[PDB]
């Protein structure tokens, strides 16, 4: 029908036609049952004590078929109250929110077995016990501790004492020893292997205990958290597995490369002070939202390494000091003078070379300047988002 | 090398960033200028500061032109360095202004950039 | 030296800037933590990047901090 309709807001009155509120029936508005108690029938109105600015978005609804924005001056926890009031129901209700920027986190699924509950509280949640807290300090301690003892392997007090310090010699042990960054033996003499194996071992605990007492073995390796996990120990095992598999020095010396790889992989235990860190999650986030524009700024970049790195060459190619051999030469210098670190290690001397350094500076002083706010909005968000 | 600019045929990135500055040309010159003032007067100072020491860095004054960006870009390699009390005197400030300086446009490009990008993507 | 800090009982702005760092406690805190996690990371790889040259400027992974 068109008959129409008042509906009086606080004395703010509204008009529209009965067959635009018979559109939605579940709502308050569109069911004559639920309606009734509001209405006057001595001004044929019916009248709610409610907020006022509120209401056009909660009748524009109605009228656009669908349609429902907050308006800009209405507060967000007002409005959706009124939303929840006028009985909108919850599919408006979520996009609603999706709108406006609150993603469902849905639910986490449960062990229902009392013992993986019993287990994946306090390796999940510091929250979950007093213990489960302990777990985390313990964590955070042997990651630490692994990130200390990693570094120690390279100060000279320590690599530099060996069979062939002084040049005499190489040795097989002291050969994989210098390359791996400690000594693989049953032994166990070497301590560095021995804060390892121990750091290791309790990372590999983590890692089993999470996996077994997990509710979902299947969006396991979906979580960067495990994989982090993962990748912390990947290292070692790996690292065994090839020395054990090449126990010659023409061998080792023919796999090296990938054990000098993986000793470099091994600082990525660092990551894993992720699960114990917000911030470090926040930024996490951040990142990912941003690749787009943090793409951008490499591919930019690169354009200008190159170009620029380019015209600085020839530039100084009849000079018989340049300090640039080659145009890929340059690129470190280019992209160095670009993000004004400036060492100085290379430097155009002619007039002609140092046009172009100028403007290579300038240029990448607003190049890098513009992801810059992306990142200082997806990271604001993500961070006023928790804490 | 220009050819590399063929590739914003299929980059919508560098169409962006090609509108960004036209569009900006304006706030883009002025930086130009600005820095222009600015390094013939800095490279100026520094020049005379040093004129009288027997192993001025700077030869000239347009000779110093290098320096002034280089310090005022915050670069700063250090091939070219003043040595007295005057000379560094500059020093500082030609730094805190090219900081100054520079840092004016970059609110323009921001815009123009964030607009012709979010006008597409 | 932190006899110079004497001189925010007179300064508005000292005051100013000091109270603004009580208040970024924990961003400015973040910018440290952030900035360890890289500096540990980077100045590691650099290291090895450069450890079968003769002439490594990177002594250590800790040296490689600075
Ligand atoms: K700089
Ligand atoms: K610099
Ligand atoms: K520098």
Redesign the interface.
Known sequence: SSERVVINISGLRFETQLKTLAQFPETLLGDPKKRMRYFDPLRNEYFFDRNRPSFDAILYYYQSGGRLRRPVNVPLDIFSEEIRFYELGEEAMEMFREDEGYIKEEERPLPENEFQRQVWLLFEYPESSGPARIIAIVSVMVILIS?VS???E???IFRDENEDMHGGGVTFHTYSQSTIGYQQSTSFTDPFFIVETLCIIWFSFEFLVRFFACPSKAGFFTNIMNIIDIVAIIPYYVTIFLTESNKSVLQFQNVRRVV?IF??MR?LR?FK?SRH?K??QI?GQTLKASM?EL??LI??LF?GV??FS??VYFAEADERDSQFPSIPDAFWWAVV?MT?????DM?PTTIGG?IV??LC??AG??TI??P??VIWSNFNYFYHRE?
């Open positions: 990130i990693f570094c120690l390279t100060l000279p000098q000793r470099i600082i660092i002070l860190s911030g470090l930024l787009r793409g951008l591919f930019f354009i190159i170009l380019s015209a003078s004004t670190v400036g060492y100085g430097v140092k350094g100028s500076a300038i002083v607003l300047a513009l810059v706010p804490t």
